[PDB]
Design a protein around this nucleic acid. Structure first.
Ligand SMILES: [Mg+2]
Length: 565
RNA sequence: AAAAAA
């Protein structure tokens, strides 16, 4: 497969020369239509072919500067000519939301509503008798709550924590999505294709499941009875796990909190209008969370936190400003409880000899570490003493920790993450090196990740109600696990590229209003990249500090051009 | 290109 000598019409993802194309990476391409003589300028700057537009594919009244998608029906290798045909009209080429949808199309990400799938979803309802199953514990009396970003309408997890003399009991209640979505149903097939929900700025979301499930029937909304799968974990007073149980349950969330509300309550800047049972559960949750964090740091875990930003857009999808995100205390509390549930479920399935898709992150090779050691040692970052074949999560963490004061610590973490590589899903039991566990999976987010849905299905079919499934049903799912992991892994790459394309588009749209401003920053990486302090975005012209002026936006390549003072 | 909620 080919990545973009310059002189046989092959494209990205389809010394040597290309002889033939076995399979195109794409069938549709986004572009701007211009007008009589017709032209298309592809959105992707790596689309280098000259295009002859078929007039019979163009509605007669379709005007210039309209975003379209086109396909190649045939091509001619002797003249570097290609024929293209218009397949979709998307809208005005200057509209930022239209550009975001074009970016999705260019990354092969479905975003248009599937009328067949929504009609199936509108047929679903709340079965009142499910709560009376002998296997489903009625927990509707417990003061569960949800803590999420203010704008989310998909809330998959609720928590309740009780203090006991010997320690703590944690209840992590996860929406019972497998109860509503039958395997190989129309809804399931569409979810498996998407593999996850998509979150773009302005809270524009492409949901893995349609809204009546993701935001209503499975969303653990306040004051609603909801069916869940509970991970219940008992801890000692040091935060060490003693026992665990998994089981289906029924809950009623008592409150829907935002991270912002909980964090301000933490700093005594405000108060929560809720029952004292909720207050006491939150207090125990934070106490338990600090203990869990201390235990995980003791056993080994790599904090790869670094600068992150989000782009705020208005109601018409025009960008307003860039915010630096603050993974604060309340967000940290939720993450600690979700990780311990995820880790526990991984071990339960493993202990029971049930094949599952793990979330894995292998130890990096000695060679890659050596290359990294060479690159960074040049940059006032200590040289580590550990053995490179045997290096533990703790040793990487200690190396980062003893450099927390280096002025270039930010760029250090970036290169280590690449050296470490991408996490992925695998049925083979590989470690998660940065989390610090030998077994890990994704269990807590089945409304928005297909892997979590699969994990719930495995629990139901093997542990909760094995009698309602056949050995051929269990083997049918087992045989598919590696293909599910592959599809999710392949699609995750596309989703990451789509968000990156979209953030570059919106950030440069915002910066195009700011030719006239000077910026400070350092170098992140044909030329010098400079990352501006105010927006965390790299302009084009490692670790040196610089100051520079914004001279132009390159809209072809979606890049910011800077000039040295 | 890690984790978590989205
Ligand atoms: Mg949540």
């Amino acid at each position: 497969i080919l990545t973009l000598h310059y002189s046989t019409g092959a494209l990205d993802g389809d010394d040597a020369a290309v002889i033939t194309i076995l399979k195109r990476a794409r069938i549709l391409y986004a572009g701007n239509f211009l007008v009589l003589e017709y032209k298309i300028v592809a959105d992707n700057p790596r689309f280098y072919l000259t295009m002859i537009v078929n007039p019979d594919s163009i509605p007669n009244n379709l005007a210039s500067n309209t975003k379209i998608a086109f396909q190649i029906d045939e091509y001619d290798p002797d003249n570097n000519l290609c024929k293209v045909s218009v397949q979709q009209v998307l809208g005005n080429n200057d509209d930022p939301l239209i550009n975001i949808k074009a970016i999705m199309l260019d990354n092969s990400i479905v975003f248009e509503t599937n009328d067949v799938v929504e009609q199936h979803a509108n047929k679903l309802s709340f079965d009142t008798e499910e709560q009376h199953k002998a296997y489903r514990q009625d927990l509707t009396d417990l003061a569960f709550v949800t803590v999420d970003p203010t704008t989310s309408k998909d809330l998959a997890d609720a928590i309740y924590v009780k203090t006991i003399p010997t320690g703590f009991v944690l209840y992590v209640a996860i929406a019972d999505v497998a109860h509503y979505v039958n395997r190989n149903s129309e809804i399931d097939i569409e979810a498996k294709h998407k593999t996850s929900s998509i979150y773009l700025p302005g809270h524009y979301v492409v949901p893995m499941l349609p809204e009546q499930l993701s935001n209503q029937l499975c969303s653990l909304n306040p004051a609603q009875k909801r069916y869940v799968v509970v991970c219940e974990i008992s801890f000692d007073n040091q935060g060490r796990i003693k026992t665990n149980k998994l089981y289906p349950a029924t809950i009623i969330s008592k409150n829907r909190f935002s991270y912002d509300q909980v964090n301000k309550w933490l700093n005594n800047k405000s108060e929560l209008n809720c029952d004292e049972t909720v207050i006491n559960s939150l207090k125990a949750a934070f106490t338990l969370s600090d203990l869990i964090q201390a235990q995980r740091q003791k056993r080994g875990t790599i904090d790869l936190s670094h600068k992150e930003t989000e782009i705020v857009v208005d109601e018409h999808y025009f960008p307003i400003k860039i915010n630096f995100l603050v993974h604060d205390k309340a967000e940290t509390m939720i993450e600690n409880l979700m990780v311990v549930a995820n880790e526990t479920v991984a071990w339960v399935l493993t202990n029971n000899k049930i094949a599952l898709p793990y979330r894995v992150h292998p130890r990096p090779s000695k060679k890659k570490l050596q290359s990294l050691i060479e690159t960074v040692g040049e940059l006032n970052i200590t040289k580590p003493q550990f053995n490179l074949d045997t290096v533990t999560s703790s040793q990487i963490a200690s190396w980062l920790n003893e450099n927390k004061d280096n002025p270039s610590y930010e760029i250090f973490v970036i290169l280590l993450l690449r050296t470490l590589g991408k996490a992925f899903y695998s049925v083979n039991p590989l470690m998660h090196f940065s989390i610090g566990s030998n077994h890990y999976t994704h269990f807590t987010s089945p409304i928005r990740r297909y892997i979590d849905l699969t994990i719930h299905r495995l629990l139901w079919m093997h542990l909760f109600t094995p009698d309602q499934f056949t050995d051929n049903e269990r083997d049918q799912l087992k045989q598919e696990l590696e293909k599910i992991a592959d599809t999710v892994n392949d699609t995750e790459i596309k989703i990451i590229n789509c968000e990156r394309n979209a953030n570059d588009y919106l950030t440069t749209l915002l910066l195009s209003k700011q030719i006239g401003k000077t910026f400070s920053g350092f170098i992140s990486a044909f030329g010098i990249f400079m990352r501006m302090d105010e927006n965390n975005f790299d302009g084009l012209i490692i670790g040196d500090r610089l100051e520079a002026k914004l001279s132009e936006i390159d809209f072809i390549q979606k890049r910011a051009i800077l000039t040295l003072i």
